[PDB]
Amino acid sequence: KRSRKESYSVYVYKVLKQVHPDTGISSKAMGIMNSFVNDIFERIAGEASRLAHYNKRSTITSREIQTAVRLLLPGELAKHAVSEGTKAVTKYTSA
Amino acid sequence: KRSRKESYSVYVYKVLKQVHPDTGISSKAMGIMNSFVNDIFERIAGEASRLAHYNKRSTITSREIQTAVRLLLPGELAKHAVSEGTKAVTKYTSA
Amino acid sequence: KVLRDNIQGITKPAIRRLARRGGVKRISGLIYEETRGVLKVFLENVIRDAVTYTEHAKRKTVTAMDVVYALKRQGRTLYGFGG
Amino acid sequence: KVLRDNIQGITKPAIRRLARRGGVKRISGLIYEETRGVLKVFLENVIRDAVTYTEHAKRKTVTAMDVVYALKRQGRTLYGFGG
Amino acid sequence: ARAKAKTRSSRAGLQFPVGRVHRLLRKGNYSERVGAGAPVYLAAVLEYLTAEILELAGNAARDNKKTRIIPRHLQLAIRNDEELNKLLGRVTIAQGGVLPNIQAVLLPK
Amino acid sequence: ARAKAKTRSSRAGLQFPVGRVHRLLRKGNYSERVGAGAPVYLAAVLEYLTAEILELAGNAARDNKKTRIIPRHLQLAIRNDEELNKLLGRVTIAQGGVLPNIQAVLLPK
Amino acid sequence: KPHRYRPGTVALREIRRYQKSTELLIRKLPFQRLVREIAQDFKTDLRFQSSAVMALQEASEAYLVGLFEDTNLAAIHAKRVTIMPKDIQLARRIRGE
Amino acid sequence: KPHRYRPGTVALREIRRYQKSTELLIRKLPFQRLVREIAQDFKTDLRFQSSAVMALQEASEAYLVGLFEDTNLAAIHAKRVTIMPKDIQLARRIRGE
DNA sequence: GGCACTGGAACAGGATGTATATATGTGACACGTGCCTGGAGACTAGGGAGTAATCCCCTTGGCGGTTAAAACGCGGGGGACAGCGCGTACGTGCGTTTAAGCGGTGCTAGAGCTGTCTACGACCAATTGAGCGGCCTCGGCACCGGGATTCTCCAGGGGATCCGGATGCTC
DNA sequence: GAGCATCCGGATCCCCTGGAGAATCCCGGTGCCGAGGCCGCTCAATTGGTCGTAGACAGCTCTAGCACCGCTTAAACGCACGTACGCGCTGTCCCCCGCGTTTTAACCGCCAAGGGGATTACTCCCTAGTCTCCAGGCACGTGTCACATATATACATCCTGTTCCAGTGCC
């Protein structure tokens, strides 16, 4: 008996099968992916936290997250992320 | 009258007046001091939150910020600042 | 209204003064336009951050504190103009 | 129990291999001891941070996630070790 | 009596967990209160990021004739993309190596 | 019949405000719980830092025959100690200039 | 015959003069024109606090003098005293710019 | 007469091999011995998870590789092909150490 | 002036090292399964936040004057740089020692899970006194001005050196 | 008497150095505006008490980290010969500093005007929180084929022997 440990294996696996039905992973590569997603999540969340600090807003919104993405992500990665997140927010709002 | 803007000037006047009763202060230098203390405050508070997360501790205590000072502030100031802080917290322990 | 050429406003004697502050003994003639380009890169890199904070703040005017944030995000923290 | 002189445990051919991965084709013989010193200072910094983290953990055993915390706080972030 | 439970990731049409990332923000000590759409937006951003980097990794592995991705392929993916390299100049990948990169003067003739 | 309102900064015997810094950590969003000794420790360490840097600024001002501190004194104070340089490697001081430093080969014979 | 200093003498006196001084080196109004020109390329009709301009200035000379200190060190590493564009490119690449 | 390559051709060969390769370049057991030896100076009786030692080994290897390619840039900048220690002090001091 | 001597350039071929094709096992990747706790659903309190109105303040726009900075040109000296020689210092190849590395085994220290509770710390009404806005004065300092001191560059003066003449000695 | 040696004195050539200008420093002199301190306000720290809960402690367990050990070569090392490189010198050429003269727009400073920060009020949209319920991700088992390893071909490559050719010295 051990305590359950959180992971992103199944979600990244689904995304990989979505982009590449025929490809596999190594476990070391998955460790890099977990470190990657946790790292980017930490970066964006902390940046949004200080934006919430700076406008004295005690509420964080997707506008703040979008500001952080445009601020941190270089180039068209930012605007692609804004497009995808905007679509997700709209179809979540409709659902 | 205008709403209050809280700042750290007068404390700097008091501490300098203890260490150098004679000297004067230019105001933009005083702003540089406010930027110093606010910057170091944010660094130590961020390390405190990070260590409280890593030990999964809900409470910010002196002991982990001591750890944070040993991390960020190097060497001689680190050990001496530890000394004055331990003296201060023991004095507050004696109310 | 619009502006088209102000990179030359950082004059060659001004760049010479900057080099004298940096301890540069001799300055080539090819240095100046490169410094104009590099300075342009840095100022645009920080001002895109600054305009991002200003549009997020729902303000139209650029404030200094946002510029301080924009420099400290790249770890080039400037002291004395906060608050 | 006590180990005394493992600084030369980082052998010369290992440094040659690292220079090959670094893209160096020709390496002076006067390089290796300063590279040992630079590696030495870097490892001192990271394990000092690591033992500080571990001593906060009240553990006698250093662990990997504490090490990667020490690296990212030093600005040399690692992936692939439980981050 | 009660409606069927429907996952919020399916509402957003996303693979990343809306509820888990929402909980992580709530216990991540970033704000006292979190808007509903912000974790959805963040999960979409991360999902796009992982999607593109996994596409690059799969293409690199297909170049290497391997059906399973390797940390070497990940290093090749990060460093051969300028924009991700600008995102990740300060990162270190375990067992990744570096790009094949030889300076031109180092070559003979 | 309440006791006289005496202050925690005086209780630690220190000049920096314990209450303001405690409040600033409480709504600075670093934890939901905070101990009482942590703001005391924090006020102590910032007072020590300001004390030493103000010592250096005062000596720099007196060496330049000024009885009022200027940011040039602050720059000369921070840059003339290597350990504060490791504290402040990436920090910009307004109107500070740089240290008077000429490379030796630049000097004439 | 009018007095004329040898090359580098007035340069080193400039080194001492501008390095002891803290006062500004960029003419503030052509700089502010450049700032507004770059700003209007990203969002139109931006308005500037003067302190925002000032900070943008202090930071720029800070970044530049960091580059020329690095440039001087790499140039004396290159056994020269005259700086060349490859040196600034090298300094930016070593900094990861 | 036995075969012998001219110098550098071999060197470029293991440059290609090791820059292609992914494995750790330094010996393992002296690296645990060294990290135990130096961690002995800060605190007594430390125990090391092997994963932590491997992570330290990878971090050290990447840091040295970055330092070495920076010294490569410095050396080709100085129109030489052989590195010398002042390249390393230059690269570190430009980097900020 | 030509033929022989010496240095140059193009070419082929062997040996090696790395790729490449195919056989094989193996263990790490991938999938099936129990579960339980973390996610979802519904209702409530309540509160940060968006928005309307104002105001004033701080930014923007424009216009005269002056000058210091900028810019252009001449000159030259200084510095980059190319090329050649030279001595060296790793590079590479062959042999050798060793010590890392792998497989195996035992002990255990401490990492980590689980139960208790008790110290400790957020929450809230009252209150007051410390801390900040307003103001006012003045003296530390910015600007101006003149003399000293120190730096710098040069034209010249001073020392070093060598050779010729005189003279005393000597044969 | 004559020839030689040698010492002294002047010619000459190369190397130092004092002197003059000038840029900055330093000492007064003046007038000025930011700093510092006093005063009034206000809101935030403090006091006290309460209730809830987070971590310290204890205890147990199991697991992984260390220690020992025995082969087993891979790798470290070292030496030797060689050839490529750092570097130093030196000539050369031209690029930028110094300096002077002319332009100009930067800056002060002065005045008009309004765009928007920003600040208070209002009313409301959303979201933490609680309770219940349930299903998706994790633990864990299993099996299995993608890849590491191994071996046999195959070609790149890389360096050197072979062959043809141009420039130049002596008869």
Residue numbers in the entry:
A (entry chain R), B (entry chain N): 30 to 124
C (entry chain P), D (entry chain L): 20 to 102
E (entry chain Q), F (entry chain M): 10 to 118
G (entry chain O), H (entry chain K): 37 to 133
Pull text from the paper.
Here, we report cryo-EM structures of human H1-containing tetranucleosome arrays with four physiologically relevant NRLs. The structures show a zig-zag arrangement of nucleosomes, with nucleosomes 1 and 3 forming a stack. H1 binding to stacked nucleosomes depends on the NRL, whereas H1 always binds to the non-stacked nucleosomes 2 and 4. H1 contacts DNA with L1, the amino-terminal part of α2 together with L3, and α3 to stabilize the nucleosome and contribute to chromatin compaction.
H1 is absent from the stacked nucleosomes of the 4×177 array, but is present on nucleosome 1 in the 4×187 and 4×197 arrays, and is present on both stacked nucleosomes in the 4×207 array. Particularly high Δβ values are found for entry DNA at nucleosome 3, except for the 4×207 array, which is the only array where H1 is observed on nucleosome 3. However, when Δβ was higher, H1 was not bound, likely because a stabilizing contact between loop L1 and linker DNA could not be formed. Altered linker DNA trajectories, as observed in our 4×177 array, sterically preclude H1-linker DNA contacts that are required for stable H1 binding.
